[PDB]
């Protein structure tokens, strides 16, 4: 009955919000990441890091507001409040982009905390820890995109800024500079996310339309009982229906629900791998066969070459405002443009 156990006792009490040992890491870090984002989006500028306005205070709306990344000149500085850049000055710290690192790092440690929470509760309750395992997928994405990617580049500046439209810009950057749509690891992620949404919708609909009649009312929700032993819908009729509409169907409820975990988890993991390649500018940018033929044959044209022209438009038209530290000056006459436009 030492103090350690007394604390364990208290941390693991059944209450409206379970705390647990993982609570000690989760709750401060989750609350700080989230408070930093609301604080910066309400009050803090990106004028000195990006030449952008980015808070409600400056005139931005929910779509355009963001906690932006530090200036390229910070490199990968941890940008600690007490560090050599801001030197304890809260105000300067904000102005130099210190809230980005605050949010990214407290967020990483909250994610760990949350995954430890899934592990802690699963152990206390007596269930298998497959929900913690599935949550590895979000983690991979977050670390690869917000940490590994800009660590392979010149600075945090080129990580995603925390904002709706800042993220849209990140999407478009990756098309023009990395040709990310062409990347087979992104395509595998696409198929996992879309395949996940499909599975989600097809499994819910199927259950709802093979229900057993277990009550008299037109509202069928009332006729389930959390503790009934009986399946509430017919796997058998569900299986014949899909075998006859689609050719194949699930027959194993256990396989089905594992497949539902497997598909979206795997796809997110594949896309994380691809982003690690782009950390290094290791892109699937080109097909060498196409380029050789196109250079020699001015009549040969594909959707592959058309999209590279668009990427070239993107880079030159957005680079100078998007990378202000580079002092890109592109006089009118060097901008790629088609006819009239």
């Amino acid at each position: 009955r030492g103090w350690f156990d007394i604390l364990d006792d208290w941390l693991k009490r059944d209450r409206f919000v379970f705390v647990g040992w993982s609570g000690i890491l989760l709750f401060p870090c989750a609350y700080l990441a989230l408070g930093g984002w609301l604080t910066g989006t309400t009050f803090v500028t990106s004028w000195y890091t990006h030449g952008l306005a980015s808070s409600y205070l400056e005139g931005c709306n929910f779509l355009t507001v963001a906690v932006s990344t530090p200036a390229n000149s910070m490199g990968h500085s941890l940008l600690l409040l007490w560090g050599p850049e801001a030197q304890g000055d809260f105000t300067r710290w904000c102005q130099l982009g210190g809230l980005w690192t605050f949010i990214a790092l407290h967020g990483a440690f909250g994610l760990i905390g949350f995954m430890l929470r899934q592990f802690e509760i699963a152990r206390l309750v007596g269930v298998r820890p497959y929900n913690a395992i599935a949550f590895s997928a979000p983690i991979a994405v977050f670390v690869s995109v917000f940490l590994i990617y800009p660590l392979g580049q010149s600075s945090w500046f080129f990580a995603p800024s925390f904002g709706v439209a800042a993220i849209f810009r990140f999407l478009l950057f990756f098309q023009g500079f990395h040709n990310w749509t062409l990347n087979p690891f992104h395509m595998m992620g696409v198929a996992g996310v879309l395949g996940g949404a499909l599975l989600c919708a097809i499994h819910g609909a199927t259950v709802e339309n093979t229900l057993f009649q277990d009550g008299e009312g037109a509202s069928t929700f009332r006729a389930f009982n959390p503790t009934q032993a009986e399946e509430t819908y017919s796997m058998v009729t569900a299986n014949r229906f899909w075998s006859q509409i689609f050719g194949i169907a699930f027959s194993n409820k256990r396989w089905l629900h594992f497949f539902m975990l497997f598909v979206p988890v795997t796809g997110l993991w594949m896309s994380a791998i691809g982003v690690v390649g782009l950390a290094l500018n290791l892109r699937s940018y080109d097909f060498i066969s196409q380029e050789i033929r196109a250079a020699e044959d001015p009549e040969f044209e594909t959707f592959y070459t058309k999209n590279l022209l668009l990427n070239e438009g993107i880079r030159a038209w957005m680079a100078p405002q998007d990378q202000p530290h580079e002092n890109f000056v592109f006089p009118e006459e060097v901008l790629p443009r088609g006819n009239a436009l």
């Binding site: 509760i121 879309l194 949404a197 919708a201 509430t232 058998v236 959707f303 957005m318 009239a340």
Partner: protein, 334 residues
């Protein structure tokens, strides 16, 4: 015993390995026409003058494409929204140049896909099921109508419906962004929310059921063998799943009613994707995403850029480069 009656019984028979049905009577020939023409065109169609400027784009494998770059190319801008069946061409050589195969394939597919949805209603009736699976499927179906029919109708040309290929898809979505700012459109944002949320809830539901499977097996065998097809008892403990997830968040944000839970699974990505289909369908009539270009200015009136303005620099690069020989006047109005 009558001849028509025996035909009708075979069409609607619940004993064919694949259900036919009256919707099937139209679906099968049209999906076969679309599929066969697709396969041949993808492998072997010669280049197609999509933009009507006598600048043919090669889409097939034998004309120097791979699986990722290939496509059935949309039909010529010279045709616009005109119906261009084979018998309207002076020859197959003309029909191939102007992109006839695209029309054939899309019209047959959209018909056959529409009957696919009907077929889903129909078999549900023959089997004594509830009927609304087909409603779930209307979301993807709607999405296909938008990129192959509604957007072409609003923009005046099938040259601007989505190519039938991997890289052509990307072309279509880049040009859309340049012209409509789809990322800044709320209905597209609800599509992402429906798709991200769908993948999330897919993973959640699959991991919760999987976590609460009842021990029915040994370490040396797939747990999947703990469920036998058609057993009457449930194969997991939902109260255990509820008890874990309720504590993970808090009790009242977790489902203990499996019917509510499975209806929620159905509605979230269906509705999200209706909205995103509606996004393409309304941007087809050029009601575009929010425009905050130069919305922030200072006391003097300098423009103070935001992320919206950076997005606009990117959209501009797409704009000025797409279909680089096809514009003779300063505004790309369709």
């Amino acid at each position: 015993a009558n001849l028509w009656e025996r035909f009708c019984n075979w069409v609607t028979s619940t004993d064919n390995r694949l259900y036919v049905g009256w919707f099937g009577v139209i679906m099968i020939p049209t999906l076969l026409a679309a599929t066969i023409c697709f396969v041949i065109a993808f492998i072997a169609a010669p280049p197609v003058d999509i933009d009507g400027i006598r600048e043919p784009v090669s889409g097939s494998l034998l004309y120097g494409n791979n699986i990722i770059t290939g496509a059935v190319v949309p039909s010529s801008n010279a045709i616009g929204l005109h119906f261009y069946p084979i018998w309207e061409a002076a020859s197959l050589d003309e029909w191939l140049y102007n992109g006839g195969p695209y029309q054939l394939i899309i019209f047959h597919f959209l018909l056959g896909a529409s009957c696919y949805m009907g077929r889903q209603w129909e078999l549900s009736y023959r089997l004594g099921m509830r009927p609304w699976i087909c409603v779930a499927y209307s979301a993807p179906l709607a999405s296909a109508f938008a990129v192959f029919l509604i957007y072409p109708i609003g923009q005046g040309s099938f040259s601007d419906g989505m190519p039938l290929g991997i890289s052509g898809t990307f072309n279509f979505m880049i040009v859309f962004q340049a012209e409509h700012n789809i990322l800044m459109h709320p209905f597209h944002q609800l599509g992402v929310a429906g798709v991200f949320g769908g993948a999330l809830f897919c993973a959640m539901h699959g991991s919760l059921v999987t976590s609460s499977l009842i021990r029915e097996t040994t370490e040396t065998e797939s747990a999947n063998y703990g469920y036998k097809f058609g057993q009457e008892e449930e194969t997991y403990n939902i109260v255990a799943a509820h008890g874990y997830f309720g504590r993970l968040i808090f009790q009242y944000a977790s489902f203990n009613n499996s019917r509510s839970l499975h209806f929620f699974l159905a509605a979230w990505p269906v509705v999200g994707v209706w909205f995103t289909a509606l996004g393409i369908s309304t941007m087809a009539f050029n009601l575009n995403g929010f425009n905050f270009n130069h919305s922030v200015i200072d006391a003097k009136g300098n423009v103070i850029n935001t992320w919206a303005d950076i997005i606009n620099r990117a959209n501009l690069g797409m704009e000025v480069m797409h279909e680089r020989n096809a514009h003779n006047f300063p505004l790309d109005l369709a």
